[PDB]
Amino acid sequence: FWDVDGSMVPPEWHRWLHSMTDDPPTTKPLTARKFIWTNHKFNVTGTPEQYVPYSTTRKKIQEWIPPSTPY
Amino acid sequence: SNIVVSTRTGEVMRILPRMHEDINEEWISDKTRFAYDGLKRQRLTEPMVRNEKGLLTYTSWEDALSRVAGMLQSFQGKDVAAIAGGLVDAEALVALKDLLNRVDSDTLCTEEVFPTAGAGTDLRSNYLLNTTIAGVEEADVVLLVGTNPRFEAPLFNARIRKSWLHNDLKVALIGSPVDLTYTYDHLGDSPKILQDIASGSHPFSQVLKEAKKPMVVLGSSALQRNDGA
């Protein structure tokens, strides 16, 4: 505390503060599928955790293989 | 054969034929059609000059090109030659022969040899398929010698079978009974057949006299044939 902000809220309750839903998730807990995150890490632009965009889909031409044999 | 090529994002996504009645008539080779993928395999990406170890290493153009500049000023005229490829563009041949002009290096070797009794390079017509693939359809009789058209010109083979399905004319192989799609008369081999037909004694040659609008094909592979002259 003395660093509180947004993104601190979990997504269900995140739906609840915005009053998209009159009913708190308490009464109606959500699907809880296997691949969804649990701790909820909130926004992290600074600090060592930090999104990095990068090249995707490997390679192109595959440059020709040099001979290893002398002569 | 003419082509419309669907490239995308600096990548060649697919090849399509570009139609032309004189040539493909919108039915390009299946071998050419999937050729593009091979461009994606290994490529001469960087210059590779052999080192003192005799092993090549990646090199800047100034190095290799100053080096070949150091070699080709040495051996003007004789003692140099140039191995032309089968796919190579005519322009590089133009500039390279011009290089050999400046040094008067007459050598101009090229992949397949082509026989030249009386020097057939001059007439240009000699090696030309003087009749167009479009012109084949009007022929009332057609003959072939040696290599089957399909393994050199599958398109043209389709032109043949199309004429066979339409124009109705005889065709027959010489030197082999290779498995063409259309009917063709069997024939033995060159030494007898060529003379029996040149004489006109051969009954098949009698059929050649019998029919007008002749065509006489040769597999260009047979132009070599050591004594293919």
Swiss-Prot record, chain A:
It comes from the Eukaryota. It is found in: Mitochondrion inner membrane. Belongs to the complex I NDUFA12 subunit family. Accessory subunit of the mitochondrial membrane respiratory chain NADH dehydrogenase (Complex I), that is believed not to be involved in catalysis. Complex I functions in the transfer of electrons from NADH to the respiratory chain. The immediate electron acceptor for the enzyme is believed to be ubiquinone. It is linked to Mitochondrial complex I deficiency, nuclear type 23: A form of mitochondrial complex I deficiency, the most common biochemical signature of mitochondrial disorders, a group of highly heterogeneous conditions characterized by defective oxidative phosphorylation, which collectively affects 1 in 5-10000 live births. Clinical disorders have variable severity, ranging from lethal neonatal disease to adult-onset neurodegenerative disorders. In NDUFA12-knockout cells, complex I assembly is not affected, probably due to substitution by the NDUFAF2 paralog. Complex I is composed of 45 different subunits. This is NADH dehydrogenase [ubiquinone] 1 alpha subcomplex subunit 12. It comes from Homo sapiens (Human). The gene is NDUFA12. The chain holds residues 74 to 144 of 145 of the full protein.
UniProtKB/Swiss-Prot annotation, chain B:
The keyword Metal-binding applies. GO terms for biological process: aerobic respiration; cellular respiration; mitochondrial electron transport, NADH to ubiquinone; mitochondrial respiratory chain complex I assembly; proton motive force-driven mitochondrial ATP synthesis. GO terms for molecular function: 2 iron, 2 sulfur cluster binding; 4 iron, 4 sulfur cluster binding; electron transfer activity; metal ion binding; NADH dehydrogenase (ubiquinone) activity. GO terms for cellular component: mitochondrial inner membrane; mitochondrial intermembrane space; mitochondrial matrix; mitochondrion; respiratory chain complex I. Residues 1-43 form the 4Fe-4S Mo/W bis-MGD-type domain. Keywords: 2Fe-2S, 4Fe-4S, Acetylation, Disease variant, Electron transport, Iron, Iron-sulfur, Membrane, Metal-binding, Mitochondrion, Mitochondrion inner membrane, NAD, Oxidoreductase, Primary mitochondrial disease, Respiratory chain, Transit peptide, Translocase, Transport, Ubiquinone. It is found in: Mitochondrion inner membrane. Its main location: mitochondrion. The keyword Protein transport does not apply. The modification N6-acetyllysine is found at residue 209. Core subunit of the mitochondrial membrane respiratory chain NADH dehydrogenase (Complex I) which catalyzes electron transfer from NADH through the respiratory chain, using ubiquinone as an electron acceptor. Essential for catalysing the entry and efficient transfer of electrons within complex I. Plays a key role in the assembly and stability of complex I and participates in the association of complex I with ubiquinol-cytochrome reductase complex (Complex III) to form supercomplexes. Core subunit of respiratory chain NADH dehydrogenase (Complex I) which is composed of 45 different subunits. This is the largest subunit of complex I and it is a component of the iron-sulfur (IP) fragment of the enzyme. Complex I associates with ubiquinol-cytochrome reductase complex (Complex III) to form supercomplexes. Interacts with MDM2. Interacts with AKAP1. It is linked to Mitochondrial complex I deficiency, nuclear type 5: A form of mitochondrial complex I deficiency, the most common biochemical signature of mitochondrial disorders, a group of highly heterogeneous conditions characterized by defective oxidative phosphorylation, which collectively affects 1 in 5-10000 live births. Clinical disorders have variable severity, ranging from lethal neonatal disease to adult-onset neurodegenerative disorders. Belongs to the complex I 75 kDa subunit family. This is NADH-ubiquinone oxidoreductase 75 kDa subunit, mitochondrial. It comes from Homo sapiens.
